Amino acid sequence: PTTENLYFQGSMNIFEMLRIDEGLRLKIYKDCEGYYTIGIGHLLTKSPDLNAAKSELDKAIGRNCNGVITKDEAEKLFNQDVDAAVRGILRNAKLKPVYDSLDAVRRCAAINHVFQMGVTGVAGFTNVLRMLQQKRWDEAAVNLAKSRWYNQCPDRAKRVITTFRTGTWDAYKNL
């Protein structure tokens, strides 16, 4: 690896990781599962009612948005959502010990996974949790690739799975 390649891990963190997986959109859109989304992966609601999504947006941002936000507002919401996912892991009796056992890069993959799926969803991968704690990375990655989370929307999940496999940032290189 070049001097520049060795610097690349210092440029990657949970914010950059999720920014790649979720993208950045300033207008309400439907995600791969058809849920109204905005910003960097902010799920507004699971209701099919666009009006509900706009109401949630205005609540979340604190002004009359009519379905559009600024980059700065997207980033604020993004930071709040990342903090929520981290807090969700750390207060959970099942996730915390697994997360604690992980290296820094795999901890990012964990926060990412919880950001995407929510705490109970993630805690439901009983076997994968045990595999991660036991450093059975290949098996963990194979089992993650069976999940509806990955299979329903592979492009959003694939990088995270690879990261659980390797504990490196390689999946986020050369976009």
Question: Shortest approach of ligand 1DV to residue 90 CB, angstroms?
Answer: 9
Nearer to ligand 1DV by C-beta: 105 or 122?
A: 122
82 binds ligand 1DV (CB under 6 A): no
Residues numbered 110 to 129 that lie near ligand 1DV (CB under 6 A) are: 110, 113-114, 122, 125, 128-129
Spell out the SS3 assignment of the chain.
Answer: CCHHHHHHHHHCCHHHHHHHHHCCEEEEEECCCCCEEEECCEECCCCCCHHHHHHHHHHHHCCCCCCECCHHHHHHHHHHHHHHHHHHHHCCCCHHHHHHHCCHHHHHHHHHHHHHHCHHHHHCCHHHHHHHHCCCHHHHHHHHCCCHHHHHCHHHHHHHHHHHHHCCCHHHCCC
Is position 33 annotated as part of the catalytic site? no
Tell me the per-residue interface mask from 39 to 78 with ligand 1DV, x by CB under 6 A, - otherwise. Answer: ----------------------------------------
Among 17, 18, 28, 132, binds ligand 1DV (CB under 6 A): 132
In angstroms, give the least distance from the CB of 157 to ligand 1DV. 11
Q: Which residues bind ligand 1DV (CB under 6 A)?
A: 89, 95, 98-99, 102, 110, 113-114, 122, 125, 128-129, 132
As annotated, the active-site residues are 22, 31
